[PDB]
Write a protein that binds this DNA or RNA. Sequence first.
DNA 1: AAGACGTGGAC
DNA 2: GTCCAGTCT
Length: 351
Amino acid sequence: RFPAREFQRDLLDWFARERRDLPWRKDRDPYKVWVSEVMLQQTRVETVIPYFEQFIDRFPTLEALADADEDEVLKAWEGLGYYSRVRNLHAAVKEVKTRYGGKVPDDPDEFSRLKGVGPYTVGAVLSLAYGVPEPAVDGSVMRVLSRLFLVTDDIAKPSTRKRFEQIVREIMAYENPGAFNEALIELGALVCTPRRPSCLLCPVQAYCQAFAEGVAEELPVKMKKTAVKQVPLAVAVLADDEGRVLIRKRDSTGLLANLWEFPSCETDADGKEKLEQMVGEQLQVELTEPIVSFEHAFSHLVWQLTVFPGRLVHGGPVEEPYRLAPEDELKAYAFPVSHQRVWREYKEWAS
DNA sequence: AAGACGTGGAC
DNA sequence: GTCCAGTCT
Ligand code: SF4
Ligand SMILES: [Ca+2]
Ligand SMILES: [Ca+2]
Ligand SMILES: [Ca+2]
């Protein structure tokens, strides 16, 4: 029905001709491919390129990452988002060193056992680094395949992803599977773009049923996103007379897990009040009026932050999860972007 | 299944 | 504003 080998040929030649020279493509080392594929989940390539280089410079091999402290790794991920990806990778890498002696499994079932490795990552890593002919269907590929075969199923359903995965199995180039999988991802990035695809330049315009019908711009099919709750948040920037600041490490479960932050309370509506009470219970502190208010978006909620400066006097030890940090050492802790802005606004207010 | 889970570009 | 650049529970 589908001229698979003709489609494979028109794609793979295009790939050779138009492939971008990205850092993770300098070799096919499984470790580096694994890091890059994780970083690229839900994250733009232009954004990832610098994080990848810092990360591989600090953690050049699978063992260097494994032997690293959890805090050093989170700092290297600081600002990339979805931080459980890196906690899972660290643990998954640890497992590969402890269990598998530092060798990345080439068995899909064995690799998918690792934390943070789901259907896309198994296919991406194993097809590119090891040649395994497993599909690597991400949102981009699903958009490409939904136009090539005019599939109107909701790509959000896992089932739809499984149909596309089956479609890949039928049309794949088993001769060079990794190149086939990367070419579909590259095709999605460069040609078959989310809006206004450049189908006239597309290597596979002849094989595309959506272009035939003139509805490429109407695919893929996807349900509109659920709106996000708004959460007010009260943040305390507290410094003593020696310039040191009070920060706390978030629980290892949930939002921004194991990241550092300035002490805060969700104030659903007394700000300086709910902040002062909380601080004592975990220190004698009295809070002043707020200096700025701003918003910070997550995928599923929006923080509405209010910053309250304050003075801190030591009347006891700083007990876990809190730490007393000189200003010059705050650079060493990983903060979420919201709280990086807290400090920015606080430091510009001080002047 | 659906929500949790960050951040930044492009439209 | 919208859409989008996968995995866990
Ligand atoms: S012809 Fe157009 S819609 Fe079809 S795969 Fe190419 S860019 Fe996408
Ligand atoms: Ca898995
Ligand atoms: Ca993509
Ligand atoms: Ca928690």
